[PDB]
Amino acid sequence: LNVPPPVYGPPQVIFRIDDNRYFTLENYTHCENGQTFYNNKAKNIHVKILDASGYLFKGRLFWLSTRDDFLAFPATLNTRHASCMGSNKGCMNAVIVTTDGGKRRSGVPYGSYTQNPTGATRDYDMLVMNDGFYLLRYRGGQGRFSPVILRWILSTEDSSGVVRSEDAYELFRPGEEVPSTGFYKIDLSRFYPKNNVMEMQCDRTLEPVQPSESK
Amino acid sequence: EVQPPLQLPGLIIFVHGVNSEGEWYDYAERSLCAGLNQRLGLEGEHGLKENNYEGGFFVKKWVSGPRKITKGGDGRSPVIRFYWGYRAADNETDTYAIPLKNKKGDNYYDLPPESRKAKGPWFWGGGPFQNGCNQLVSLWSKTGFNNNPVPLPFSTQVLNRDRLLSDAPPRHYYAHAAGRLAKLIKTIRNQHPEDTVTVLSHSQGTMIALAAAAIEAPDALFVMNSPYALENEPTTYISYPIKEIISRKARSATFADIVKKVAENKTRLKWIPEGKTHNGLPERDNHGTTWIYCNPHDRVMGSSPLRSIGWQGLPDTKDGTPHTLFKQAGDTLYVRILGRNTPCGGTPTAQTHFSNLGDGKPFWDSTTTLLQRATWPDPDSGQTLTINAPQVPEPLTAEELKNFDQDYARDEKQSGGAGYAYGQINPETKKPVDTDYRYYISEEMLEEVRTYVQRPTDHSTLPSDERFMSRVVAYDLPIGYCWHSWDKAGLEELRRQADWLESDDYYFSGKLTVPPIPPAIKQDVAEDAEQRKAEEKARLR
Ligand SMILES: [Ca+2]
């Protein structure tokens, strides 16, 4: 109909890998929508990664990948606004994986069907290594204890570019004979970043309000 | 490494619904284990934790993951993931235009006919869909759903002649699946006598679960969003055969006798009910209880063809007196509601609001047109509920549930390839909106309208809710007085016997083993032969 044009906020970083590489959210009305782009000032990269806000991912992310051609970023749906809410199966988060620098994008689904896509991220750790990426889903109640580890590695035999490596659990002595329950618990301080950033952050003050359509 | 014992407090059997493969299983399991861990003071490596199963993948096209434990995913969980469904015969596969998939996850209508049925026994996980029912006798019906001239709707299908509503196969696969469940329960009690058996059912699966109760009742029964109806609606009159139109007194007596059969097991040799929680409430022995969980936004159970106990629960009389079934089933029958602007798990209330939800919004999420309101009519004026269920330490405030009834996220026109509609790709997760699409689509007009933004139907909202299981249902579960250090491979054998893809000869060959109708299931037909003509004449118009 006679739609009014929307105003977007200015681009702001939501996950700073280091000085040169960082994830910027832009073209957005609030911190729960917009798009997230991968930026590398040295290589002058500015390519789109998610068609949604990366702030929805409330888990932890550890970027150890030194490659600007392999990118993996968690695609998380919004609990308050998503077409799969109420559906008889629910929603399923995923990871957007590109192996060409960002031009061709693919989606690898993870996790279980839920009615709270953001609420599931609060229980997840994600490592982005040069050779792929690992997802840790914590079980139990309180604390981040007793995880299940899912590993994805580069392959040229699949459209995504990655395939699950059964030989995971190399985070903790790769010859430790993993049991049925699974390493209670696992230490990731060897992956802790130098800048001490793990969660996605957003500054609501830059969200542009607009007092339009008085009637 | 530190290897601790299991010591589970009673087994739990998840019973899924129609065209369902236990989607809510994983993360009802996670939440319920966390709730039990807080309720019973378990901590550290001693606490319970959920199992983790292999997810799906592409081959592309979606494939349901193999029902196998992931590497290092076996956790301390008392959940037995039951499964059931319908398989086609060895020579009668495509007589019923219904979705069909093999174990590997291939669409029957996507392979050449000569290759089809070479291998990969064709079936559908959870039974067709247009085949639900609102009574137990219809599970033994020799006759399936007939589409000939709103009847049996189940979302995942356009609204506002007869697309996907092909004539359904006979309903023995319901009763047979119930017999399997009644086997497993009795089988458990043979192997394990001093433990607790809990059945946790959803949708049509409630009937299957209820039928197993009339054969071998468990120590606890939970029915979420049940299609059980104590009165025959006009649609029930026009659709079901004369043999399967059950009187009001008979349906009420059937339910009451099932609750009594379950309540039989409330006396065992003596958790410790000598325990008061951190919020000053007394821990409760929930042996022999039967719980009815309802959702007032259920687009399937609130629809005029059903209007069942999974939606309105046990409503109150015209003068406020509680439902007549409460006195019938005794003091072991409880009811809980989960809707917007409505506390769940609070202090029991006499006339809990149903028709007036208390926030100005209409009862039905975005239901305005005459046809929409004819399919989902508003509940009767001033309908009320009794919530006789106990209180929990951390109940759900009505403000927490002010956002619980979902709606159209965006009902604008769709582009065709990049949008949020049935057969599209979620532009965010790069994953299809609804996966079942492929196993269903079988000029472009019709297939070009395969972008109908399916209206969210609050059917899976109740079982999937992490808050509801962790803070309410966890305390609603019964716990045996003497826990049992559990068995290594015995429990895995139970899970193998539960998954019909691993033990049901009906899946391997097709040999249905239909159990006889138990005495608790009444077949008293109401004098409705004439009344069927009354509703039939109106359809002529
Ligand atoms: Ca809704």
Provide DSSP, A164-188: E-S---TTS-TTS---SS--S----
Report how far ligand 1's centroid is from the alpha carbon of B433 (Å): 17
Neighbours of B242 (CB within 10 A): 11
Local structure of B126: helix, strand or coil: coil
Alpha carbon of B381 to ligand 1 centroid (Å): 21
Assess if residue A145 is contained within a domain.
yes
B13 - beta bridge partners? B80, B199
From chain B, pick out residues whose CB is under 8 angstroms from the CB of A107. Answer: 429-431
Between CA B465 and CA B4 the distance in angstroms is 30
Q: Is B264 helix (H, G, I), strand (E, B) or coil?
A: coil
**Residues in chain B closer than 8 A to A138 (CB atoms):** none
Task: Count the alpha carbons within 13 Å of A63 in the hemisphere toward its beta carbon.
Answer: 25
Residue A148 phi, psi (nearest 5): -105, 130
Q: Nearest to residue B154, comparing CAs of B21, B300, B306?
A: B300
Resolution attained, angstroms: 3.6
Give the Cα separation of A213 and B394 in Å (integer).
42
Whether chain B has a CB inside 8 Å of the CB on A183: the answer is yes
Cβ pair A75:B410 closer than 8 A: no
Q: Are B420 and B456 in contact (CB under 8 A)?
A: no
The range of the structural domain enclosing residue A57 comes to 12-202
Residue A49: closest C-alpha in chain B? B428
Angle between helix B205-215 and B248-263 (nearest 10) = 60
Query: Which chain B residues are within 8 Å of A89, Cβ to Cβ?
Result: 20, 23, 434-436, 460
In a domain, A207, yes or no: no
For B366, the token pair is 């975005």
How far out from the chain centre does Cα B206 lie? 6
Q: Is residue A3 part of a domain?
A: no
- Partners of B33 on chain A (C-beta within 8 Å) are 139-141
Contact A160 B58 (CB under 8 A): yes
Cross-chain CB nearest to B460 (options A80, A89, A120): A89
Nearest-CA distance from A40 to chain B in Å? Answer: 22
Give me the amino acid identity at B371.
L
Q: Which residue has the tokens 């003068």?
A: B319
- Which residues in chain B have their CB less than 8 angstroms from residue A121's CB? none
Chain B contact present for A186, CB below 8 A: no
Write the CA distances from A83 to B302, B431, B433, integer angstroms: 21, 12, 8
**For residue A106, what is the nearest residue in chain B, using CA coordinates?**
B430
Place of tokens 């089809």: B116
The answer to whether the CB atoms of A111 and B466 lie below 8 A apart is no
Largest CA distance in chain B: 74
Distance of alpha carbon A30 from alpha carbon A203, whole angstroms? 9
* CA atoms within a 13 Å half-sphere pointing along the CA-CB vector of B92: 10
Q: Which amino acid is at B302?
A: G
The helix/strand/coil state of B30 is: helix
Q: Is A107–B429 a contact, with Cβ atoms under 8 angstroms apart?
A: yes
Taking Cα atoms as reference points, which of B232, B361, B363, B349 lies closest to residue B299? B363
Candidates B18, B25, B428, partner chain A, best to mutate (most A CBs within 10 A): B428
Are B461 and A183 a contacting pair at CB < 8 A?
no
| Distance of CA A85 from the midpoint of ligand 1 (Å) | 8
Closest C-alpha among B182, B407, B385, B366 to residue B292: B385
Query: Which has the closest alpha carbon to B16: B102, B107, B103, B86?
Result: B86
Residue of B nearest to A141 (CA): B34
3-state secondary structure of A110: coil
Q: Is A208 among the domain residues?
A: no
- Do A59 and A123 contact (CB within 8 A), yes or no? yes
Cβ distance A77 to B434 less than 8 Å, yes or no, reads no
B132: nearest Cα among B225, B221, B213, B222: B225
CA of B373 to the centre of ligand 1 (A): 15
Structure tokens at B173: 């696969």
How far does the CA of residue A19 sit from the closest CA of chain B (Å)?
27
CB A132 within 8 A of CB A151: yes
In one-letter notation, the amino acid at residue B273 is: P
Question: Does the residue A150 lie in any domain?
Answer: yes
User: A-chain residues within 8 Å CB-CB of B56?
Assistant: 109
User: DSSP letter at A113?
Assistant: -
Fill in the DSSP letter of residue B310.
H
Token code pair at residue B541? 């118009």
Encoded tokens for B113: 């006919």
Under DSSP, the state recorded for A123 is: T
Q: Do B74 and A180 touch (CB under 8 A)?
A: yes
Q: In angstroms, how far apart are the furthest CA atoms of chain A?
A: 68
Contact A48, A35 (CB under 8 A): yes
Q: Tell whether A197 is covered by a domain.
A: yes
**Which stretches within B333-403 are classed as H helix?**
370-375
Pick the closest to residue A168 from A183, A154, A151 (CA basis). A151
Does the beta carbon of A87 lie under 8 angstroms from any beta carbon of chain B?
Answer: yes
Number of domains in chain A: 1
- CB A150, CB A110: distance < 8 Å: yes
A113, A115, A164 member nearest B465 (Cβ)? A115
CA B301, CA B31: separation in Å to the nearest integer?
25
The size of the A-B interface in CB pairs under 8 A is 152
Site from B430, B434, B453, B492 to mutate, A interface, most A CB atoms within 10 angstroms: B430
The answer, for A173 touching chain B at a CB cutoff of 8 Å, is: no
DSSP A208: P
Considering the domain boundaries, does residue A184 fall inside one? Answer: yes
The helix/strand/coil state of B91 is coil
Separation CA B205–CA B356 (nearest Å) = 30
Q: Is A184 on the interface with B (CB under 8 A)?
A: yes
3-state per-residue secondary structure call for B492-532 = HHHHHHHCHHHHCHHHHCCCCCCCCCCCCCCCCECCCHHHH
Q: What is the CA radius of gyration of chain B?
A: 23
What gap in Å lies between CA B502 and CA B18, rounded to an integer?
Answer: 19
Q: Which residues contact A65 (CB under 8 A, 6 or more apart)?
A: A71, A72, A128, A129, A130, A133
Alpha-carbon distance of B12 to B48, in angstroms, equals 13
Length, in residues, of chain B? 541
C-alpha B455/C-alpha B155 separation (Å) is: 8
- CB A92 to CB B49 under 8 A? no
Q: Is residue A78 part of a domain?
A: yes
Cβ-contact B229, B251 below 8 angstroms = yes
Contact call for residues A58 and A121 (beta carbons, < 8 A) = yes
Q: Which residues pair with A135 in a beta bridge?
A: A126, A150
Please, what is the Cα angle at B18 between A95 and B420, to 5 degrees? 35
Smallest Cα–Cα separation from A70: which of A160, A135, A158?
A160
Q: For an interface test with B, which of A71, A80, A88, A151 has the most B Cβ atoms less than 10 Å from its Cβ?
A: A88
Q: How far apart are CA A180 and CA B6, in angstroms?
A: 13
Q: How many CA atoms lie within 13 A of A2 on its CB side?
A: 2
Nearest-CA distance B33 → chain A (Å): 7
Of the residues A85, A99, A106, A139, the best mutation for testing chain B's interface (the one with the most B CB atoms within 10 Å of its CB) is: A139
> Any alpha helices (H) in B244-338, and if so which ranges?
248-263, 309-312, 324-329
Query: How far is ligand 1, taken at its centre, from the CA of residue B366, in Å?
Result: 9
Angstroms from A114 CA to nearest CA on chain B: 6
DSSP state of B212: H
Residues in contact with B197: Cβ distance below 8 Å, sequence separation at least 6, in sequence order: B10, B11, B13, B185, B188, B189, B218, B219, B220
CA B232 to CA B336: how far, in whole Å? 23
Quick one: which of A160, A115, A123, A209 has its CA closest to B59? A160
From the list B153, B152, B67, B24, the residue with the least C-alpha distance to A87 is B24
Residue B469 DSSP SS3: helix
* CA neighbor of B311 nearest in space, from B299, B321, B320: B299
Backbone angles phi, psi at B57, to 5 degrees: -165, -175
Determine phi and psi for B384, rounding to 5 degrees. -140, 155
Ligand 1 centroid from CA B463, angstroms:
14
Q: Which two tokens stand for residue B142?
A: 């020799």
Are B404 and B396 a contacting pair, CB within 8 Å? Answer: no
Any B CB within 8 A of A13 CB:
no
A146 touches chain B (CB under 8 A): yes
